[PDB]
Structures are given as C-alpha cells and as structure tokens.
Design a protein around this ligand. Structure first.
Ligand SMILES: [Ca+2]
Ligand SMILES: [Ca+2]
Length: 326
DNA sequence: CCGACGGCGCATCAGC
DNA sequence: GCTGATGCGCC
DNA sequence: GTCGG
C-alpha cells in the first residue's frame, strides 16, 4: 500500500458524504478515486500526478496536495471535531442503521453505543441484532476460519439435497487472507429462470444450518436472499468464536455465471464492469447480460456458459477473481 | 455546460 | 391486504 | 465529485 494515507483520506470523505451529507454520488466518486489510487503502482508525489487518473478530478487533486504537504486534511480534522457528524458516522456502523436512522437517533439524543443498549425497544429487528453483535461484526475472519465455515456450509446443504451447489463468493473467492463476512451462492436444479419446481429451497437450507447451530440469528429473509448471523463451533474449554455475518443468495441454476460474477465482486469492480458494459451496449445484473436497443431498452438475455463469456461480450480480457479486488 | 453515475432483494410505511 | 417510495443492505 | 460529449 504505497498510498494508504491518501486512500484512507478519501475513504473517510466517502463515508462522511454518505452517512452525514447523504450525498450518494459524492460517496461513489470518492470511492472510485480511492480505488483507482489504491491500484496505482507508484508512490504518489503530487495531486497533478493523481489527476491523471480517471475518477480523480480537480477537487481531489487539491486535497491530495494538502495531504502530501501536511499529513492531514483540515476538512476532515473539522469533521472529526464535530459532535453531530461524529455521532452519526458512528451509529451507521451498526447493521440496519443507515444515514437516515442515525440522524433520527441523534435527534432524539441517542448517540452512543451505551444509549443504543438501553434503547433496544426503539430498534427494528435488523438493528437489534446488529447492535447485539456490534463488536463481533467489526472483527475480520481469518481465511482458516473461512475454510472451516465453507466446509460446514457445503456439507450441510449436501445433507439436505445432494443436488444443491453452494459456492463461497465475495472476498474469499478472490483469495483474500481475511474476509469481512461470508457470501454463499446457492443453486438447485428445481429453480431456473423457466420454473420453480420445488418450494422453500432457500428456507430448507437456512433451517438445516439453524439445526446444527451454525446459523444463530436472522437479519432478513425472503425466497432468494438470506441475511443473517452464524458461528463456528468451538472445542472443549476454549473461548467461543465471534459471531459472523452470512449472506446466502439463491440464484436460478441456469444463471449461475452471472450470479457468481456478481457475488464475487468486488463491489467497485462490479460497478466498473457494469459501467463498461453499458458503453459496449449491454446491461449486466446478477441474472443476465442483455443487449441495449436503439432506445436503451434491455433486449433478451444473451447465451452465457462461463464467466469469461460475460467478459467476452463487453470485450474485456478475462480477469481471475483474485484480480477483481478493486 | 450538464446528464449520468450498476443493479437489485427485503423491510417498512404512507396512501388507498 | 396491495402498490410504490424509501431505507438499508449485498457484491 | 468526475467525466464524456
Ligand atoms: Ca463479503
Ligand atoms: Ca456479505
């Protein structure tokens, strides 16, 4: 990380714009800039040098010049000083509390972890579980634990129905030595774009994982997406593992490659790739890649038999998951 | 200058 | 109840 | 906040 100071600065600004200003485009701009700088293979010596990069404009150039000169940014110094900004930024670190709810809480005088813990009845379900495991969800997951988690999940769905396929995606699939959480893609042949030949396909898997005490809580749950909490079992006389966030996404079996491309990410890589696709006259979601018509209306799904086929359509050389960490 | 910025699942609420 | 908007979440 | 046109 040659430019960790700069990318941290920009990430902090992104978070401020999102959580406090509620300026989502500024949020995205700062994150794009942080990402392009993060992969830039030189120690940056000036804001002019940075402005050469796409997504870094005049305003970020000037900030970079300030940061390089002084080691800090006065704008961020003041934001860190501000009680209301500081409080809102903190509250959004709880899962389920976004920028709107955080500001509303701060209005009511709920602005610390302690305040939240005495006001649980003022939270919805997601928020209550996010608060319950606030400390644990701050922790990262070593790959060794991710491998244990993978082995449990893959073997338990195998027990429900051997025709399930579970694939761990996200940062794990990109080969990260540690992950923020666990993302699991699920398919079953009875769920395609053409038909659903069995009910409760996701529910049965969630229930089995609950049965063996792996899944411990649920943040939200529908027919194709589960958002919840899980925990590795621990051995005799040793401290319990931290509770971990887990997402499970059931995708039509014939749309696996669009699905695994989406769920492998990174999020910025996906934004970049989908933005690029548009410029080639295609639109990509987790299901399909479709041509855009003369009017900009999405056409019918294109044939896809591999991840590379999706890259092929938009004229990108294939990129392995490990090179998608943007 | 200015439109566009990736795409969507689940929970919640107002209006009906 | 539903539908559409909004909030928050995922990559 | 940034970029393409
Ligand atoms: Ca993840
Ligand atoms: Ca996740």
């Amino acid at each position: 990380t040659l430019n960790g100071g700069i990318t941290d600065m920009l990430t902090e600004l992104a978070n401020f714009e999102k959580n406090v200003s509620q300026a989502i485009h500024k949020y995205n701009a700062y994150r794009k800039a942080a990402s392009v700088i993060a992969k830039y293979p030189h120690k940056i010596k000036s804001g002019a040098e940075a402005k050469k990069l796409p997504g870094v404009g005049t305003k970020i150039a000037e900030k970079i010049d300030e940061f390089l000169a002084t080691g800090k940014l006065r704008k961020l110094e003041k934001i860190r000083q501000d009680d209301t900004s500081s409080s809102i930024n903190f509250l959004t670190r709880v899962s389920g509390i976004g920028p709107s709810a955080a500001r509303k809480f701060v209005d009511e005088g709920i602005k610390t972890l302690e305040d939240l813990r005495k006001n649980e009845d003022k939270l919805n379900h997601h928020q209550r579980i996010g608060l319950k495991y606030f400390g644990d969800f701050e922790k990262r997951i070593p790959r060794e634990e991710m491998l244990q988690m993978q082995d449990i999940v893959l073997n338990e769905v195998k027990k429900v129905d051997s025709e399930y396929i579970a694939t761990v995606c996200g940062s794990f699939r990109r080969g990260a030595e540690s992950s923020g959480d666990m993302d699991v893609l699920l398919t079953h042949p009875s769920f395609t774009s053409e038909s659903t030949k069995q009910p409760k396909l996701l529910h049965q898997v969630v229930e089995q994982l609950q049965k063996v005490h792996f899944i411990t809580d649920t943040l939200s749950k529908g027919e194709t997406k589960f958002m919840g909490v899980c925990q590795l079992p621990s051995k005799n006389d040793e401290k319990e593992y931290p509770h971990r966030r887990i997402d499970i996404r059931l995708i039509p079996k014939d749309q696996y490659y669009c699905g695994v491309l989406y769920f492998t990410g990174s999020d910025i890589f996906n934004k970049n790739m989908r933005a690029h696709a548009l410029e080639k006259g295609f639109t990509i979601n987790e299901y399909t890649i479709r041509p855009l018509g003369v009017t900009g209306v999405a056409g019918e799904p294109l044939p896809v038999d591999s991840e590379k086929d999706i890259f092929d359509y938009i004229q990108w050389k294939y990129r392995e998951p490990k090179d998608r960490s943007e």
